[PDB]
Ligand binder design. Structure first.
Ligand SMILES: [Cl-]
Ligand SMILES: [Cl-]
Ligand SMILES: [Cl-]
Ligand SMILES: [Cl-]
Ligand SMILES: [Hg+2]
Ligand SMILES: [Hg+2]
Lengths: 97, 97
C-alpha cells in the first residue's frame, strides 16, 4: 500500500507502483469528474498530460482509446505507462525537452 | 495527382498532400503484405515508424488502433498525421532528437 486499484488493468509500464497508483487514480478522478463521457475525453487527455508534465517532467503524450491498439515509439528505454480503466485504454509516455 | 486514395479518410494532418500520399500508400502496402491481420499490426507500426524516421527525420511515434481515440501531445506545432484505412486508425507524429 498504496496499492494498485482492482478496477485498473496494468498492461505495461516501466514506472514504479507508487507512480502507477498516482497516475491511475488521477485518471479515474478525471473520468469521474467528466461523468465518463467519450465526448469530453479530450479534456481528460489534456489534464493527464499537464498533470504528468508538472509531476514527472516534460514532455508527456497521452492517448486515450477504446478497442485494440499496436504501437511503436522507441526500442530504447523511456518513461511509459499503459493501462485500462473500464472501456478506456490510456497510453502515456515521455519524450525529450 | 498524386492524389489521396479514396479508401483513406484523412482525419487531421499538418503535412502536405505529397507527404499524405506517401505515408498512406506505405501504410496500405504494409497492411496488405501482412494480410490485414491485427495479430501482426505491431510489425506494421514498427515498419511505419522506421520508414518515417528515414524519410522525414527522427523521432516518429506510430499508434495503430481500432475504435475511438482522444489525444494530446502539444499545443505547439509539430509534424503530425492521423487517418483511417478500413478498420484501422493510424496516428503518427514527430518528437525531438
Ligand atoms: Cl499522459
Ligand atoms: Cl514498440
Ligand atoms: Cl509512424
Ligand atoms: Cl491536443
Ligand atoms: Hg494518459
Ligand atoms: Hg502510423
Amino acid at each position: 500500500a498504496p496499492t494498485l486499484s482492482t478496477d485498473i488493468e496494468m498492461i505495461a509500464t516501466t514506472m514504479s507502483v507508487p507512480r502507477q497508483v498516482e497516475v491511475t487514480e488521477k485518471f479515474k478522478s478525471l473520468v469521474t469528474a467528466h461523468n465518463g463521457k467519450d465526448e469530453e475525453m479530450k479534456d481528460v487527455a489534456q489534464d493527464m498530460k499537464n498533470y504528468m508534465d508538472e509531476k514527472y517532467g516534460r514532455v508527456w503524450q497521452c492517448v486515450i482509446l477504446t478497442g485494440s491498439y499496436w504501437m511503436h515509439f522507441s526500442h530504447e528505454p523511456f518513461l511509459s505507462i499503459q493501462f485500462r480503466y473500464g472501456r478506456h485504454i490510456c497510453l502515456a509516455w515521455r519524450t525529450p525537452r
